[PDB]
What does this fold into?
Amino acid sequence: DLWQTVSRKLSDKKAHKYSLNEIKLFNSTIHAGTQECKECLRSDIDISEDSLCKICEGIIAISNDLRDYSFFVVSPEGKVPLPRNRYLSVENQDGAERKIKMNKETRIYSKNQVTNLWMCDYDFSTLNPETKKQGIASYVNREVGIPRLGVLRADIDNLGTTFIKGIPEQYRSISRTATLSRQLSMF
RNA sequence: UUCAGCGUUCUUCGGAAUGUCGCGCAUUGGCA
It folds into this structure.
């Protein structure tokens, strides 16, 4: 019951999400802007010559790195912004060591191995350099079979039911609800 | 010895389509 009460309060934090001063601040624009990012469609932030704001440009740059480099570095200097005056930079082991000894306040996360984070980044194209350059095109390079790409979009059925009543009230406890989620995340 | 033709089959049996391509390219996407 108690966790549900927490979820009862969470829904109350999303109804009255913004205070009047923040709402007034969003309303009080001074200049409309002369250009916007082609992705974010925002004009207040400075837009580069490629019609990209700094955040979206960082995201697009960091996308190859997350797949290529295991270490994630929450550091004063990095590609994409993070909550407390820091940035997320994807680096190798040498770069992670350099940045953590450079500045004491560096947080390091390890991809599938310093706190360890689990994420699936399987990419057959990266197995070879020329295949890496090709990317998706490499897959349709087939001597036989129609050269077509197959997109699998999937969702675990009743994932929310599993997180709500997936454990019988007899075995409802913190450890199991953490283990069940951890096993689902690991798979 | 003369007088006459008469009856029965009217088409039959096979093969009835097959093999080959079954959209491609450009823009777009993707990689940089």
Summary: Residues 64, 125, 132-137 of chain A lie near RNA strand B (CB under 10 Å from a C1'). Residues 54-68 of chain A form the longest helix (15 residues). The beta strands of chain A are 71-75, 80-81, 87-91, 107-111, 115-117.
